[PDB]
Design a protein around this ligand. Structure first.
Ligand SMILES: *[C@@H]1O[C@H](CO)[C@@H](O[C@@H]2O[C@H](CO)[C@@H](O)[C@H](O)[C@H]2NC(C)=O)[C@H](O)[C@H]1NC(C)=O
Ligand SMILES: *[C@@H]1O[C@H](CO)[C@@H](O[C@@H]2O[C@H](CO)[C@@H](O)[C@H](O)[C@H]2NC(C)=O)[C@H](O)[C@H]1NC(C)=O
Ligand code: NAG
Ligand code: NAG
Lengths: 98, 146, 49
């Protein structure tokens, strides 16, 4: 009854190409792609800067790199298990749609 | 009904202006009266300072920012092996121009000779993934030897 | 119509109180649970606690 729905300007594929670029910037270059050009840096050295930014001396990362990497990989695993099992995790977005 | 429609949309528009006045008041405090660590809050680049200029029903911030330029690619390492010791930079990163090793600060290329003054020890060569052997100059040593 | 006028102004006023509760929740996290480097966020002067 005169209701219409207009499409978004960015397609969900364009949105996913922006999140791809933000990931690939963050992983390959740290914060530096926000400050200017993406300065490449090895991810373990970027992680050692990020440790120095919480006041934990960077050797604590290099001397524990296998453990810190396993804790990251394993925590990303548990994100999938949460989202796959628990649709009510998306409760803010589904509430807006409702 | 026409006046109620106008007042309702002015009340919703006043809330948008007030959200923008709260943002402007916060950029005043953090960008102008301070220096901001909040990324892209006080403009793109690393924030240095901001200057407010007034405008009709608004404010304009001239955000001065340091933007880095003229990258060089270098070989890099997490740590340096010396006499069993693993050395890490106190500040900066290890970089190499192919054949020699330096420590530089992170946001500008200023290569310094690697020493016990610009690096700190922790543990030994075995642990670190990708440590690279190079001498670490101890500045005291020539002062005793001379 | 006087009920819709009331509920409309209360929906708008709720959004002003929610903006102030989002601000008070932010002040709680940054000022109380932390120490804030944000100038004038946790009062004038350099913030201690
Ligand atoms: C890497 O940096 C070092 C130090 O700046 C360079 O070594 C110097 O090079 C000049 C020109 O050949 C010589 O006059 C100096 O005597 C060298 N110093 C030392 C301590 O050997 C080196 O040439 C650079 N290498 C590259 C590939 O850029
Ligand atoms: C850095 O130096 C170490 C020690 O000089 C090298 O590793 C081995 O160390 C033992 C003594 O701890 C020596 O007996 C071996 O000869 C060394 N192996 C080699 C292949 O030299 C280490 O290899 C050096 N850096 C490198 C290339 O990783
Ligand atoms: C760094 O090296 C790669 C090749 O390994 C090259 O494509 C790139 O342009 C270089 N970047 C700079 C800033 O020199
Ligand atoms: C980088 O990878 C190579 C093999 O591709 C490996 O031999 C080297 O030790 C690694 N260096 C660092 C700093 O991780």
């Amino acid at each position: 009854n005169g209701l219409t729905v207009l499409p978004p300007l960015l397609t969900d594929e364009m949105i996913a190409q922006y999140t791809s670029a933000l990931l690939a910037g963050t992983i390959t270059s740290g914060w530096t792609f926000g400050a200017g050009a993406a300065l490449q840096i090895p991810f373990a050295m970027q992680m050692a800067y990020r440790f120095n930014g919480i006041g934990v001396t960077q050797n604590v990362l290099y001397e524990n790199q296998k453990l810190i990497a396993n804790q990251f990989n394993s925590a990303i695993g548990k994100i999938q298990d949460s989202l796959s099992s628990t649709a009510s995790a998306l409760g803010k977005l589904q509430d807006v749609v409702n | 009904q026409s006046l109620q429609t106008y007042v309702t949309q002015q009340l919703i528009r006043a809330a948008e202006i007030r959200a923008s006045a709260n943002l402007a008041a916060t950029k005043m405090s953090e960008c102008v009266l301070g220096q901001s660590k909040r990324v892209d809050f006080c403009g793109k680049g690393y924030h240095l300072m901001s200057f407010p200029q007034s405008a009709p029903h608004g404010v304009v911030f001239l955000h001065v920012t340091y933007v880095p330029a003229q990258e060089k690619n270098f070989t890099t390492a997490p740590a340096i092996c010396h006499d069993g010791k693993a050395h890490f930079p106190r500040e900066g990163v290890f970089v190499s121009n192919g054949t020699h090793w330096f420590v530089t600060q992170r946001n500008f290329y200023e290569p310094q000779i690697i020493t016990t003054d610009n690096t700190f020890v922790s543990g030994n060569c075995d642990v670190v993934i990708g440590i690279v052997n190079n001498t670490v100059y101890d500045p005291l040593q020539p002062e005793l030897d001379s």
